[PDB]
């Protein structure tokens, strides 16, 4: 998934 960083993130 994509829990956060880089940028914009939901899941």
Request: charge should be positive; charged fraction near 10%.
């Amino acid at each position: 998934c994509k829990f956060f960083x880089a940028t914009y993130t939901s899941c």
